[PDB]
Amino acid sequence: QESVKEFLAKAKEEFLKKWESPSQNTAQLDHFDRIKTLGTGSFGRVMLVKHKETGNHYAMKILDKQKVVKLKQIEHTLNEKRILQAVNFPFLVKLEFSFKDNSNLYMVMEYVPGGEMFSHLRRIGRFSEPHARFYAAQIVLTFEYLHSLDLIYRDLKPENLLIDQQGYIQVTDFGFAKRVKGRTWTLCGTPEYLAPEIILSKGYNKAVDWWALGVLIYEMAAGYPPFFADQPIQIYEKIVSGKVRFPSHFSSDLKDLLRNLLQVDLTKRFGNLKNGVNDIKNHKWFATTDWIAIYQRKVEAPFIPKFKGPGDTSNFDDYEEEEIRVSINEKCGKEFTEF
Ligand SMILES: COC(=O)c1coc([C@@H](CO)NC(=O)C(C)(C)C)n1
């Protein structure tokens, strides 16, 4: 479709201009008040902050440079910021500022107050097929955009899909995203969502994102993932067998789509054939989807999250509140020069 082709050609031009000349050093820590920790990991955390002059709220991801180095995430953190400052799509969380100091790296993102899809899915149990399809369509369009820019996302899971004030998705966490024209090799992603070729240590490509979409759609519509088991080794055995059991409540169209996304042979997997994403967009499970209306945000969402305003944290959970310490000495300056 020439209109889609021309849209994607412009998207790639605009991405490349920012990719080749990345913004740097566009805010500083003492311009913000710290409000609350919204999540925390082995080298980073996300905190709600408020800009002291405008009053705007933001989600600030703070990465400790020394822990990034120890956990072998240098390149991944540089990928994340360089990609996020260069992309622009309705269903991606927007990076507003970035900066670093003696101790940390900071990415100041728009704050999405409705919470993770994960919380909502686990609360309700499972989504109906129309509800799962609304979210799936947004992921299909987002992956069409990213892949056209030669980006692989590599962290699709329900925790990374935030629900905005209109009930639409914002994908967050670009920590594993990478610009890859061909193959890449790093072992990364959560166990339930890993494609077989990642588990088997192969050179893999963008087809891993389409596999993960199959896992996500299955989990949204069933309430649990297709290769579930108690420990990773057992999850990995199920994935590489690719034997899947579908609930009888799944439609025949849903099972057919999922057999083609959860195809172990990556050379046969939907999204990775000659017709690319159009095998997915034209599949019968998506026959009711108006792709343009989804992109334009004209479809009424299945679910509007309950929250009181742009500062409400009630859809995220509670963590021990730790200091944001900044050393008097610069740490790991060389490794993070380009941030
Ligand atoms: C716009 O809002 C956000 O980007 C936002 C809100 O809360 C989060 C939290 C929990 O999802 N994430 C983390 O803390 C990680 C450490 C990356 C897992 N991100």
Swiss-Prot record:
Kindly provide the PTM information from the record.
Autophosphorylated. Phosphorylation is enhanced by vitamin K(2). Phosphorylated on threonine and serine residues. Phosphorylation on Thr-186 is required for full activity. Phosphorylated at Tyr-319 by activated receptor tyrosine kinases EGFR and PDGFR; this increases catalytic efficiency.
What are the positions of the active site?
Answer: 155
Q: Does the keyword Iron-sulfur apply?
A: no
Question: What membrane topology does the UniProt entry give?
Answer: Lipid-anchor
User: What function does this protein fulfil?
Assistant: Phosphorylates a large number of substrates in the cytoplasm and the nucleus. Phosphorylates CDC25B, ABL1, NFKB1, CLDN3, PSMC5/RPT6, PJA2, RYR2, RORA, SOX9 and VASP. Regulates the abundance of compartmentalized pools of its regulatory subunits through phosphorylation of PJA2 which binds and ubiquitinates these subunits, leading to their subsequent proteolysis. RORA is activated by phosphorylation. Required for glucose-mediated adipogenic differentiation increase and osteogenic differentiation inhibition from osteoblasts. Involved in chondrogenesis by mediating phosphorylation of SOX9.
Q: Which residues form a coiled coil?
A: none
- Can you say where in the cell this protein is located? Cytoplasm; Cell membrane; Membrane; Nucleus
Q: Which GO terms describe its biological process?
A: adenylate cyclase-activating G protein-coupled receptor signaling pathway; adenylate cyclase-inhibiting G protein-coupled receptor signaling pathway; cellular response to cold; cellular response to glucagon stimulus; cellular response to glucose stimulus; cellular response to heat; cellular response to parathyroid hormone stimulus; intracellular potassium ion homeostasis
Q: What SUPFAM superfamilies does the record tag this protein with?
A: Protein kinase-like (PK-like)
Q: Which GO terms describe its cellular component?
A: acrosomal vesicle; axoneme; cAMP-dependent protein kinase complex; centrosome; ciliary base; cytoplasm; cytosol; glutamatergic synapse
Q: Where does ATP bind?
A: 38-46, 61, 110-116, 157-160
The scientific name of the source species is Cricetulus griseus (Chinese hamster)
Q: At what positions is Phosphoserine found?
A: 128, 327
An example of a Pfam family matching this protein is Pkinase
Assembly and interactions?
A number of inactive tetrameric holoenzymes are produced by the combination of homo- or heterodimers of the different regulatory subunits associated with two catalytic subunits. cAMP causes the dissociation of the inactive holoenzyme into a dimer of regulatory subunits bound to four cAMP and two free monomeric catalytic subunits. Activates cAMP-sensitive PKAI and PKAII holoenzymes by interacting with regulatory subunit (R) of PKA, PRKAR1A/PKR1 and PRKAR2A/PKR2, respectively. Interacts with NFKB1, NFKB2 and NFKBIA in platelets; these interactions are disrupted by thrombin and collagen.
Q: What is this protein called?
A: cAMP-dependent protein kinase catalytic subunit alpha
Where the protein is mainly located, per its record?
cytoplasm
Q: Where is the AGC-kinase C-terminal domain?
A: 287-339
* Catalytic activity, EC: 2.7.11.11
